[PDB]
A paper describes a structure:
ICV, however, has only one major surface glycoprotein, the hemagglutinin-esterase-fusion (HEF) protein, which possesses all-in-one of receptor binding, receptor destroying and membrane fusion activities. To further evaluate the infectivity and transmissibility of IDV, we expressed and purified the ectodomain of D/OK HEF, and determined that it also uses 9-O-Acetyl-Sia as its receptor by glycan microarray. We also solved the crystal structure of D/OK HEF, both in its native state (resolution of 2.4 Å) and in complex with its receptor analogue (resolution of 3.1 Å), and the structure of the enzymatically inactive HEF (resolution of 2.4 Å) alone and in complex with two receptor analogs respectively (both resolutions of 2.2 Å). Indeed, our results show that IDV HEF is functionally and structurally similar to ICV HEF, but with some distinct characteristics.
In order to study the molecular basis of IDV HEF and its receptor / substrate binding mode we solved the native X-ray crystallography structures of wild type and mutant HEFs both at a resolution of 2.4 Å. Due to the presence of cacodylate buffer in the crystallization conditions, S57 in our IDV HEF structure is covalently modified by the addition of a dimethylarsenic group. The covalent modification of active site serine by arsenic was first reported by Ian Wilson’s group in 2003, when they solved the structure of an acetyl esterase, HerE, and its complex with the inhibitor dimethylarsinic acid, and illustrated the mechanism of the broad scope inhibition of serine hydrolases by As(V)-containing organic compounds. The electron density of the covalent modification of S57 is shown in Fig 9B. In our IDV HEF structure, IDV HEF is proteolytically cleaved into the subunits HEF1 and HEF2. To confirm the proteolytic processing, we isolated IDV HEF crystals and checked for HEF2 band both by SDS-PAGE and western blot with an antibody recognizing the hexa-His tag engineered at the C terminus. Furthermore, N-terminal amino acid sequencing of the HEF2 band revealed that the first five amino acids of HEF2 were IFGID, the same with ICV HEF. The exposed fusion peptide has also been observed previously in the HEF protein of ICV and in the cleavage site of IDV HEF structure. Unambiguous electron density was seen from the ninth residue (F9) of the fusion peptide. Although we cannot observe the first eight residues in the structure, different orientations of F9 in the HEF structure and other known cleaved HA structures helped to confirm that the fusion peptide does not insert into the cavity.
Numbering used by the authors:
A (entry chain B), B (entry chain B), C (entry chain B): 9 to 157
D (entry chain A), E (entry chain A), F (entry chain A): 3 to 193, 197 to 429
Write the structure that this text describes.
Amino acid sequence: FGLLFVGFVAGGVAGGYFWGRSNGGGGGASVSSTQAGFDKIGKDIQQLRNDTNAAIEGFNGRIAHDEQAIKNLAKEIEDARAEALVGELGIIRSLIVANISMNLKESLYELANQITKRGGGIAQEAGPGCWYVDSENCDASCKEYIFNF
Amino acid sequence: FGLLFVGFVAGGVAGGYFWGRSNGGGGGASVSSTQAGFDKIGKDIQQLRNDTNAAIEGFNGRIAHDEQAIKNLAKEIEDARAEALVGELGIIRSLIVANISMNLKESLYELANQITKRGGGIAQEAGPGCWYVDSENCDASCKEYIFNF
Amino acid sequence: FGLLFVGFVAGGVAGGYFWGRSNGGGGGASVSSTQAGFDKIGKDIQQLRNDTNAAIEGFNGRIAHDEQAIKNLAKEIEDARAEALVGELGIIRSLIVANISMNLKESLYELANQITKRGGGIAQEAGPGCWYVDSENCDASCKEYIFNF
Amino acid sequence: ELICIVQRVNESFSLHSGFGGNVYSMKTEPMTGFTNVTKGASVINQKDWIGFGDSRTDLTNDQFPASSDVPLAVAKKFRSLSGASLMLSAFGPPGKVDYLYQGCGKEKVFYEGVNWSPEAGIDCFGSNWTQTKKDFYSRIYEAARSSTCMTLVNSLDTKISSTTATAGTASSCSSSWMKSPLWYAESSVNPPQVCGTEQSATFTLPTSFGIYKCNKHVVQLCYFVYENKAKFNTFGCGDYYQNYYDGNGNLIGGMDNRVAAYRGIANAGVKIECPSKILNPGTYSIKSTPRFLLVPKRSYCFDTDGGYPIQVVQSEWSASRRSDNATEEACLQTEGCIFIKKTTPYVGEADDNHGDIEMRQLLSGLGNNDTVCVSQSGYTKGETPFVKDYLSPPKYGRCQLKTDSGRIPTLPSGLIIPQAGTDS
Amino acid sequence: ELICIVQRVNESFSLHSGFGGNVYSMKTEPMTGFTNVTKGASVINQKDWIGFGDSRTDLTNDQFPASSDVPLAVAKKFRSLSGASLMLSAFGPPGKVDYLYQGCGKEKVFYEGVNWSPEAGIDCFGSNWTQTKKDFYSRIYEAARSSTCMTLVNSLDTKISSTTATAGTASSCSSSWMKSPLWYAESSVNPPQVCGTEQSATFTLPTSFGIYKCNKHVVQLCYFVYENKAKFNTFGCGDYYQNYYDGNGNLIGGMDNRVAAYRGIANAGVKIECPSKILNPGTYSIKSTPRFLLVPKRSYCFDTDGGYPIQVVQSEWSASRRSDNATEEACLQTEGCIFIKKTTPYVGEADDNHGDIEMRQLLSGLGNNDTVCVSQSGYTKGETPFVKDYLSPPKYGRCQLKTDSGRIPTLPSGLIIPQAGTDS
Amino acid sequence: ELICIVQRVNESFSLHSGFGGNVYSMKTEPMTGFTNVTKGASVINQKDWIGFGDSRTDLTNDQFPASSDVPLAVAKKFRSLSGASLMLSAFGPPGKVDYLYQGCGKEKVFYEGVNWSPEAGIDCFGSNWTQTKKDFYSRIYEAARSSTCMTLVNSLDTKISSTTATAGTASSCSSSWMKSPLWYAESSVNPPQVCGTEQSATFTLPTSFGIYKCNKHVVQLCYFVYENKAKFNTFGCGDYYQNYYDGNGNLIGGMDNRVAAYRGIANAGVKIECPSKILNPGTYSIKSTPRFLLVPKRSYCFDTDGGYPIQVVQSEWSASRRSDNATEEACLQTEGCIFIKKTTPYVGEADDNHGDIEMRQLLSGLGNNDTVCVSQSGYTKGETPFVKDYLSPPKYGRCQLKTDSGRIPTLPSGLIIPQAGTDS
Ligand SMILES: *[C@@H]1O[C@H](CO)[C@@H](O[C@@H]2O[C@H](CO)[C@@H](O[C@@H]3O[C@H](CO[C@H]4O[C@H](CO[C@H]5O[C@H](CO)[C@@H](O)[C@H](O)[C@@H]5O)[C@@H](O)[C@H](O[C@H]5O[C@H](CO)[C@@H](O)[C@H](O)[C@@H]5O)[C@@H]4O)[C@@H](O)[C@H](O)[C@@H]3O)[C@H](O)[C@H]2NC(C)=O)[C@H](O)[C@H]1NC(C)=O
Ligand SMILES: *[C@@H]1O[C@H](CO)[C@@H](O[C@@H]2O[C@H](CO)[C@@H](O[C@@H]3O[C@H](CO[C@H]4O[C@H](CO[C@H]5O[C@H](CO)[C@@H](O)[C@H](O)[C@@H]5O)[C@@H](O)[C@H](O[C@H]5O[C@H](CO)[C@@H](O)[C@H](O)[C@@H]5O)[C@@H]4O)[C@@H](O)[C@H](O)[C@@H]3O)[C@H](O)[C@H]2NC(C)=O)[C@H](O)[C@H]1NC(C)=O
Ligand SMILES: *[C@@H]1O[C@H](CO)[C@@H](O[C@@H]2O[C@H](CO)[C@@H](O)[C@H](O)[C@H]2NC(C)=O)[C@H](O)[C@H]1NC(C)=O
Ligand SMILES: *[C@@H]1O[C@H](CO)[C@@H](O[C@@H]2O[C@H](CO)[C@@H](O)[C@H](O)[C@H]2NC(C)=O)[C@H](O)[C@H]1NC(C)=O
Ligand SMILES: *[C@@H]1O[C@H](CO)[C@@H](O[C@@H]2O[C@H](CO)[C@@H](O)[C@H](O)[C@H]2NC(C)=O)[C@H](O)[C@H]1NC(C)=O
Ligand SMILES: *[C@@H]1O[C@H](CO)[C@@H](O[C@@H]2O[C@H](CO)[C@@H](O)[C@H](O)[C@H]2NC(C)=O)[C@H](O)[C@H]1NC(C)=O
Ligand SMILES: *[C@@H]1O[C@H](CO)[C@@H](O[C@@H]2O[C@H](CO)[C@@H](O)[C@H](O)[C@H]2NC(C)=O)[C@H](O)[C@H]1NC(C)=O
Ligand SMILES: *[C@@H]1O[C@H](CO)[C@@H](O[C@@H]2O[C@H](CO)[C@@H](O)[C@H](O)[C@H]2NC(C)=O)[C@H](O)[C@H]1NC(C)=O
């Protein structure tokens, strides 16, 4: 229901970002499209994903010095060190996922903000990624200009 | 003053989430209620708190292998390991608190967003959790419908 | 273009927080000032910076116990421990920078929110830190009152 | 009209900081806590441990299970026989049960010793069997901590040069003698006129015994102890000596009173001492005073493939009999040895000396499938990384650390309010 | 009209959690992975290593490079000569090349041994040169792991008390004798009537040799081995003995059949044994049976400034000749020694025994400038902290850890949707 | 009209990345830094350390505090007496002050030695007291690093077999003799006709001394050194020997010229050597050539309950007197020993040799209540985890790590602008 929410859909049905519209005759019956020209999201996602390399390269570049003269594997010590390293990798992961989440959401706020400023102010925001465009001052070619579908 | 702010109150006075209203005769004198039917916040808080178990279980499940043949406690080494582990627990804590903070705030944004879309668009947002409802198109039974008090 | 965006400027030109205005005769030509009376940002930045001491003091206060009877430096082990500690310091840094980023942005949202509520609701928000003030109900002394320039 | 949700806190609310958001709350709950510690014995891996025991873990005992300190499933993991003990098998004194202890397990549980205590009244010229006992189990525990397996070696290849010397026998030793050491004496040596010829012998510690690799042997390098030269010279000529050599002639053991002072307790008569030594496999040599020769006939075979710290269980009688704490003291002075000790007397279910309630509790952990740490303070499960008090070494596994409860950080609970920005 | 961007996910989308935001995605990619492991030898620091070798790393060989298992640049880092070996220089048998091995490097590569194998047919009364070989390289490797440098000491200061004894010679030893030990024999000792006088000697291990500090010396403390006293007494009177002492008179080596059993193989005749020992610098003393005296004349000098675990390369002939695996077994039983072993026969490019394709592959790492870890499983670059299988010790450097691929966490990829709050 | 706050940056602004938000700034400040390192001695725990000293830490000195290198509060923590030294108490030479050093402290500070230097001109047939000194303090430091406590044992139980031997005296030793070793000589041994009987003796190292547990004893196993047999035979018959044995007859010390070469400096005459050895408690035996017997009469008692690395302070005279650096070299070659050394001459305030300004600065840390690390480079407080240069071992406590300043990350300062999303 507009950028603060993610909804579920059944068997078929494409997942992603769609245009959804509202009332009309009183009461209306809603409607959801089949995805827009949001190529900015596509590009922003690619950039965000590639930006994860910095955090990963730092982790890969970190390997502890060691020296064992012993002739038989100290399996349990070996496994303990791995487990700790994996634990550290776990935290970094959680940080990266959140970092993508937050920056993508901000990129989505930037998308909505540009749309607001193109019907200014015929748009009228109703929370992020939602607008009350009054079908009075704004016909159909108008909304097409404002929301690109 | 509406979801971007947390204010303090004196000796008595309940803390929490309240309804606050504005002007009128010019100039008015403000007014704050005695907490709403925000059971969604109550449920969201419970869910958020229980979701902390994942981060905690991961920490508890991580215990380093060791082997000492020594007969007397190496107290200082012992204490140093604990201190490091506690330091690690400190970081996780800080991450969990922020994670609750941010997701609760987002849950509060979702609460406000639903309210906006129920008086649409008699509401008119003024920052998160604030609205200019014009007491012209909207009497009292109206605002009751929109803000549930 | 208003708090969701940071723009670049050339050789001269001061960086910072400015007032920017829009259309008019159709079509207008935009305009950006030379920084406002945002002393709240100055104070918020100072407070945020000083709040970093808590995270830093915790790190400085953590020094691992050790005991070496050996007469010659174990250089590679020595360097490995440093590298790990530096790696840990790297993560904390990344957390602190984000913590400043996010709390400053929230302080900027609080700045904008106060401005909204001072022209209420002549303001009309258009994303964070942007407003459609209609130069009809609001002359020049009005906008001066609302946006302090 | 302006309508707002309003966020506010009391003096009862305290602020919790986060990286990317703070939280106001009234209550806090600790993030984690301490793991309980259970006294007694246990294992971190049920598929790789071995127990060595006596009647108190012998499932073939007629009074089982009432005579047992462990249930059937644990008993199957012990190599035990009623009446047996490592030391009894080491020497093989007459009429005592002579069990071939052998097995493999990275974790080891030792629960005997009691069947050779003062109560058993074994003499055989022993100077002090309790001292011998302590020294013996010291060497066993020391070698076992670094070994995967252990076996009795019930017969060493031996060879005496003398063609006239015959096998010694004693009234104080049931009118026979130990299985080990072998005692050879020269009838003709009489100090009259006849001094005799220096006695010689070799013995071999093998590189293996059955399926068990031997990298180390615990053996006794015994000798006689005399009060002085004068008392010795009523038996032989010169000074008493019995020296043990490796294949090159390095002195590795024995007693030589040509250079070392006599230390026999006055008017006690002849005594035998039997210190245990850890030796590499090989062929060793002996030179002795003509009259008396002692030759090692058994050992305990160990490998050096590694093990965990061991567990030794207090092995004493009920109050009615005479016990010792030699295995306790052996364990205490040996690295990598963990001692399990009762706090109340041994009171059995089958007899006085079999099937004790406290011991069954202390051994019940042997036992469980979820032990992750074993220590001198007891054993733990893998609940948290923390314990209220230190786990005393020796210890191994996923072992918890001691921290003060005050240092364990908290999380906000109850009614909660987010906060971010400076709010001013 | 209300117009909204709508966010939705499929059954194909799974949820990934973050600290401060979650992500919905359809695909995941692992965050990192395993670093390959290359078999063979290498170094983590090209500016601090030393190789010791023979013709197979000798750039002065007439058939170079076809006779070589390393290219020119690696060869320059070896101290090598065609025909040489550590052991050959240790004893200096007649007509064999006698190279002065010396050098410094924290990482060490040992690639010889083969020039003294059974194929060389050196006799010189040797009891078993293969056994001597294994014992010798054992002591070298042991001392080298803790040392920065190594040098042959080609001449010890020696001094014999006897004024009649002369320098021994043997038909079985090319009608001369080793450079070390020196063999002095007494012509006049005849068991007839004449027993002779006990022979004496000192030898000195120096505190330095050229520019090399000596904290430790590998030397051989040799002696003759006889079948029994009876066979010895056709040469000398009494029992055979040859004992080595420090400056105070502590027995540190030798063979003394006055206390130790004879162990000479029957009807083999006299044999010489030459075990290696690690000794501190100082002046040492010798006492021997009158007829035969043996005196150490060489050593290998080591410091105790530290080193890394060493690399030993299999040194054998092509199938046509008779090899041994003494350096393999020496390496296997010695801490801090890593062994490089071929899996196919030695087949050379110049001759049968020089310039093998597999060995060139195994040694090519010596080689690279980006090796960060060297282990008994091979060497790695610094790609990730992880490997699919363990790196077997010995090992050193920035060494990877084994984790299951399943434990390596993932990141969202493909079409991605953010999520936060409870959305309800 | 659209009115907006506008966010913009210059070429002067650089971008800093965060997990959940980035920051633009013009300036950066480092997040943390290096902790200073102070040369000299100190302690990490004021409630568990002990000092051993002489006049320079003796608060009972008539010239205190001007004669002292430490103030009153530190002096109270020293066990010191004017004129004393560990070595002086070890031997007890005539007329020298004989202080009973004893105490307990996990951290130990040793600040004497100088009262037995060449300046003191003690002879007593000493071969080289400086060498003896170095060897003595080596053994003290070695045993002290693993011990909680230390005490002089001023009298061992001793027993000589000989009934005719009498107590030796020397003109070179003030016409008397050491407290330790005791010198017994046989008047009647004359090489004329009379050789005498081999001398024998026992001495006992106790399991405790007063309140101090003894697990280890530092003792001297002395002997006479002769140029050769010929020079010895003007005093006794045979070869010189003096051998020390444990209770079983294992040779543990001494000098035996029946097997070891004579090494006495030519025409020097008889000399005594006194190497120190660390021995377990027990009763030990002695056999000597008839004429001269030496018997240990003192020791230093140590436990094995653990300690920290020790601190040894340079103990030398002002330039006017003859010093040595034996305690420096003893410290240098001993694990766990940290040496404090002046860089300028000793110039005192009370006399030439007492109350030096540099030494007071170097010792002032003994001193402080906020030292967290002590190392061979000096000591630190707990400011940061980092230092600019390595802290040389030995070291203990909360010790800082060396990192380059470049690797220390920064934080944004000055005018700051947040950034998130892609902004495009
Ligand atoms: C025939 O041989 C017998 C065996 O040799 C001999 O019996 C021995 O006789 C001696 C002298 O009477 C007794 O000596 C006493 O030993 C005790 C016990 O010491 C050991 O344990 C203590 C710690 O005990 C404390 O903690 C335990 C629980 O762990 C409690 O039960 C106890 O009540 C205490 O609170 C420990 O401090 C000792 O450590 C010493 O030894 C080790 C090395 O072995 C060192 O590392 C350490 O630094 C220290 O020196 C020790 O481990 C002791 O507390 C007393 O002070 C006293 O020394 C023996 O107990 C006794 N042993 C046996 C097996 O009976 C017979 O006397 C002899 N017969 C004849 C006629 O000679
Ligand atoms: C009576 O006995 C006296 C004591 O035995 C004896 O005096 C000794 O005589 C010898 C020979 O003249 C001298 O030998 C020299 O020793 C020095 C010092 O070596 C020690 O320190 C060096 C490092 O020194 C460097 O760093 C220090 C600061 O730490 C600086 O002051 C110095 O200027 C240098 O820059 C070290 O390298 C040495 O290490 C060796 O020994 C250790 C083990 O002990 C090994 O681990 C190591 O690998 C190495 O072999 C050593 O610790 C040395 O530098 C010279 O080259 C030379 O060897 C002694 O100094 C001297 N000692 C005393 C106490 O006086 C008398 O000669 C004798 N009298 C008679 C008549 O015989
Ligand atoms: C759920 O939605 C996604 C896309 O929103 C569907 O993924 C597409 O599937 C086809 C065929 O499998 C691919 O060729 C497309 O490239 C996918 N689109 C994207 C954006 O990746 C998916 O099939 C849907 N799943 C279900 C169960 O209906
Ligand atoms: C501040 O506010 C909180 C609630 O907003 C008050 O907490 C309540 O206190 C009563 C009695 O102590 C409890 O029975 C209620 O359950 C509490 N409410 C909640 C939501 O937990 C608190 O008393 C106030 N404190 C002050 C000092 O006035
Ligand atoms: C970019 O902008 C910043 C400020 O927005 C300029 O910084 C100022 O520079 C002067 C002289 O260097 C200082 O005295 C001021 O204190 C600075 N202002 C602030 C807020 O710090 C900077 O000069 C600009 N850079 C360029 C290249 O034009
Ligand atoms: C992240 O930044 C915030 C804001 O600078 C820090 O919040 C401060 O924390 C202290 C103690 O927790 C409070 O007394 C201050 O009042 C807080 N400042 C504000 C403006 O709220 C927070 O501590 C930082 N997070 C961490 C884990 O260091
Ligand atoms: C941060 O908080 C969120 C919200 O409480 C956690 O999100 C939950 O994660 C689990 C498993 O990842 C999901 O099944 C739940 O549905 C999520 N809850 C919600 C409301 O979305 C998140 O896991 C926390 N982050 C971390 C790393 O622990
Ligand atoms: C979190 O995500 C952001 C956005 O993907 C990362 O920001 C990038 O960082 C690099 C170097 O710091 C910049 O050059 C890019 O321009 C940034 N991208 C954007 C879109 O701003 C950030 O580095 C990540 N945080 C961490 C600590 O890795």
